[PDB]
Prior knowledge:
This is part of a larger assembly, with two copies of chain A. Chain A has 29 helices and 55 strands. Chain A is α+β, with helices and mostly antiparallel strands. Chain A has a seven-stranded mixed β-sheet, sandwiched between helices. A seven-stranded antiparallel β-sheet of chain A has the order 33-32-36-35-34-37-38, sandwiched between helices. Chain A has a six-stranded mixed β-sheet with strand order 3-2-1-4-11-12, sandwiched between helices. In chain A, helix 3 links the parallel strand 5 and strand 6. In chain A, helix 12 crosses helix 13 and helix 12 runs parallel beside helix 17. The structure holds dihydropyrimidine-2,4(1H,3H)-dione and calcium ion (2 copies).
Amino acid sequence: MKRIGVDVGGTFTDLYFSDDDQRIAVVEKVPSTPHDPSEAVINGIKKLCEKAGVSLSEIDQLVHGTTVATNTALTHTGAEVGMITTEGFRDILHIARHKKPHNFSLQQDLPWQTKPLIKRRYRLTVKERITAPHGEILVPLDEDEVRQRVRELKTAGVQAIAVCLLHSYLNPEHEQRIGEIVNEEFPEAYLSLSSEIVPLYREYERFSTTALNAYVGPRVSRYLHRLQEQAENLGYQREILLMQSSGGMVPIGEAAKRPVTLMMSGPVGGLIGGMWAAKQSGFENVVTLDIGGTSADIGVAYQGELRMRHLLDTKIGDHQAMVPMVDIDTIGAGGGSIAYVDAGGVFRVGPQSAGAVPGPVCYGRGGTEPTSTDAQVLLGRMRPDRILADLDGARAAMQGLADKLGMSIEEAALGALQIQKFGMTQAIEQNSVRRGYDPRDFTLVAAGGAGALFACEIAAELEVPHVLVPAHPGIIAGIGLLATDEQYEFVATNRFSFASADAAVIQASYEQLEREANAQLDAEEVPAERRKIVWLADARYEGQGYEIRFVVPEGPVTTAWLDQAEAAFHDAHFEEYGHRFKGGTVEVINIRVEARAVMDELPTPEATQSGSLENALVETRPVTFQQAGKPVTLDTGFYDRAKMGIGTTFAGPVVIEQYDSTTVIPPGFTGTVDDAGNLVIACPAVTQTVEKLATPILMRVIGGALNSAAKEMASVLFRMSYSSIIRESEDLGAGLFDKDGNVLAESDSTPMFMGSMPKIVKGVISVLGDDIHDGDVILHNDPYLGATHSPDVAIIEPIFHDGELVGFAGASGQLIDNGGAFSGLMVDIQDVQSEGTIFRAVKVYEKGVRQESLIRHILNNTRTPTSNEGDFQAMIAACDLAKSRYLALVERYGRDSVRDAGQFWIDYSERMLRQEIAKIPDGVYETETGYLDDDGRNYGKKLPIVVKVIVEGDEITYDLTGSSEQVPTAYNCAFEGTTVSAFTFITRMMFLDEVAFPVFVPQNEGMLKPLKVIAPKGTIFNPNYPAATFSRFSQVQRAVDLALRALAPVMPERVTAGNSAHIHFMSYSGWDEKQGEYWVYLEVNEGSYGARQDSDGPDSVDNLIANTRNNPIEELEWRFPMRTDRYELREDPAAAGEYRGGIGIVRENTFLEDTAVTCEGERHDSDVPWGAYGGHDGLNASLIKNPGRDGEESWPSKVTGRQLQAGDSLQITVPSGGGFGDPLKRNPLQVLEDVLDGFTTTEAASRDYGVILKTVNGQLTVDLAATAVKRENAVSE
Amino acid sequence: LGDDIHDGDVILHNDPYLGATHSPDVAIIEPIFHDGELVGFAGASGQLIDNGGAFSGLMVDIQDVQSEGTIFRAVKVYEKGVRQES
Lengths: 1277, 86
Ligand SMILES: O=C1CCNC(=O)N1
Ligand SMILES: [Ca+2]
Ligand SMILES: [Ca+2]
């Protein structure tokens, strides 16, 4: 009946108050206090109630939109957290998924390791185990140990404790018992059980959710309690509600128990508020757009409902989570984006941010670079007398951008805005075109900041005729608080497939969730005559690894209910990707119940006013628009919109100046003001005049579109794939090519497909020739015609327009099995024919007609036919999608324009790489001969690797003379595709780093040109046919690491010390009798990372050429017959230095059935990881069957098909890296942390580093008196 | 195949779990048609020198059937008499 909503953004505080019978809406804002968030809400309420003259005791409900929990996790300003976890897994929050954020960087630090929420000194272990799938107790709980660990945590001074055991979502009795011990021994400690925060599987994501919860728990619990107790003293007798990131109210008590759901809340309110203003006029389909000061938030609401984001995309800053969130696209192109031409002569805006501190110099603030917002001033969209209420400070400041491009005086500003428009529009079209949305039906809605500026421009590109702006864009966040309804989410993990399902267990699971939902609603005193309950489910095809959420019908679960739910899955899949699989089984993973309580809908406030243009017309200043490309200045008036009434539909180019927003209407079109205060502008979609564009803009538009096509085809292929190597390792490549085969656009998904796609398409062109027709689909994997290695299979489709070949679209990924000599992986084999099936430009669809017999023959020759068929379908779908997006610009601009735009980016890439190679002094750079362990067929004999690097001019050559001859195993590297690809990748890493280098250079044909690799025929790096090249990874890893050691004397700042430069690529496989199928698990064990000159080396992460993700343990134990019994950091210290070398992991996998094991190992009995500038050397790996038990065997690095029976375990120990610099110059304040964490021992701290740590007052501290003495007498010895 | 038998068809087969001796022996079957009516089959089979398996020629120490080489499962060589070049 009487409701208020308060939202706190970070500078301003917005308050909205509405009434049903009185029909009064009050708008009020109040300045916010950043140091104390409580003193901004209370004061706000005090200002709201006094103006209207109402009492707080009459409010039915109030909603709060704070963001304190976000700023605590982002700035890492929370509490000391302890962890009681299963013993042997003490390092899970350290490992993460072992994937770096960036694929092509060497100077990047992992945020979860560098600033961890639970430090390693406070992570403790308890001996017990609970096993899937039923939840039996394998190891009994010891009662003395748990109490001792709790008391240790209490003595240290731990404020919050996060209990995180494996499989606690299955049965939580161990965590419950631990909690009941904790509360009685440590009453004043925040406690979080992982089972009660998110009872779902995936242990890293669940423990990270729990650890974030426990990290921000003590802070926001205090803030919420203070807010509730202070509001009650004012007179508020009810309970306060809190807005979550999924859309929904939740009371204070439950909000203090799950703070993790409050983080990143407030962009969601904008989308819901936009839906509210859109449904007044009558449009159900909405596209909301908010351009703020730094970023742009985009939200697409089809028919008027929210869209939940993908699991992989759910992350708070850098840490993952499993909290439900609304899919909102954040784009860097906002108010703070700098416009510049780089050294390669290319126009780009962003992603470097200017900030609000410098500001535009025309307003009189002080700046030194051209900004996105300063471009709006030049054209006249923003008045130069708005904030205040030099003039040429903007025109003359862009001289360093205008004349340097060949632009006109006034057209420079237009370019900077059009580039942002297109960047946002292809972001939208990525998530609009494949979804199957007709843009004419939709409506664009603006928001606060600068949202209405790009409204008609973007709608023209999308072809959207309706543009709507709400009555007050500056409060849409507050209004969207009140539009949503109080709902509770209760979830469970309940894995079933529709093939073998029971309509009684499912009903009981949903009834359990319903029981707890009704019990939650009983405590809030809500009548039973208004409780609406909706059921949902997360499902996926069998073989995939991520789910889609969709609404299932109302209960009870009957026989027809199953059919309706299975149909709803296909409807929700088709709507997200745009493809329909021809087979496969659907399985539900998680179930959800939302118990909504619709109390009353928010009515539109109908108020009427009177006015005209003549009331507030102040003056007329010149304003510049785009007239068919040319800049023509024209007259423009200014007046406030708070003076006109309803039906004041007037024409003329005018600029509306509201207190919070701006609305500028294009000339020649009128804007209708409806009764509700909204405006509907008749924006043009199809017009009769062709406009002009400058040279810098046209290249970026087509290039960005080809780029977006590459990344869109990548995401479709990898999200829909059945293969785990394509899905988790991201071992794929995709992009668009021209007639000659030169790549124009590439997905950049993995370093393993660097420059290898052009070789694939050129290899196809050279074997087919003119035998290229329309509707053709081509398979290719030949490693002597450009492929990386046999298991990666590529699909190419010709592109035709009016019977003329214009290009190609291509996608490639690694299958699980290709029908080779061993399941999965292989080392000890004869030649290339032993590797499996080779495809040599085999065409899949002749003239568009599917050759059923050819598809069937291919699918009969693999051990995993269901997975392989799924991967073929996903690759064909991504190529179809890219062909569509290419023909779109062929029709839009022209065939010659598309060919020319593709040629421009090749020479941009080449120019940028050559400028960097030319700066290194010319010469010949050498190093020590590296060694590899035996080939595999004959143990003992080492294999040398010599890398010499020659630099002459703007060209670089890698000479591998002196490397070994061909070995008769698969332990060789393909020259074009692997050797050239790896040295192209290390060149890009060395000179074009993602972190240090300012701009991101796309992967085209121009990167492949400025380097050459000379490797004599008949070596391991350039073998003669028919040598097998299946196992290629470790050789090129060591080769590029030796290339780093060779160039270390001249380039220290862009290299690293001795990396592990290895892989332990494992294949565990067996035959499942019940399913009648092979089960294959392919594991990529991460290595470690040698130190750098400026920062230490991250432990436990995929190194150099690899950037894979691990499979979660709980998913593995549900899917395969195994049990990971240990996964942590190795015990011995790794390597000393000024910056420490990285530590490897020791993973102990035990097995429950007879399994076969193949390993691609390296660095067991051979050369140690090196160090630099006097840094120590790392350690070699090992492979031991049954550590500390009966049957220990010291396995070599590379094995092929060794058997394990049952109860056997493999202890895989991976190498540790080397250090960089002399250990005697390390910081004294850091070795203290290293000893307590367990990185290095106390006895070996005086020798290598030379720091004396003495125990004083119980605690260990660094003494600055005896440290300087020891450093003197440590050089001579 | 069943009723998926047309004139001018040529069929390749070597599956040892569907009647073959062992993988290296590959068979060719051709349907015989008279007045649009199936009347019989003609068939020939022999051992190739190499079938693209794990080792050249012969093999003993290998994993399973998929490591023996290529499996043909009633593959049509000539659909309706026209040669499938690809
Ligand atoms: O997953 C991976 C890592 C090693 N090599 C490869 O081809 N894929
Ligand atoms: Ca691969
Ligand atoms: Ca024979």
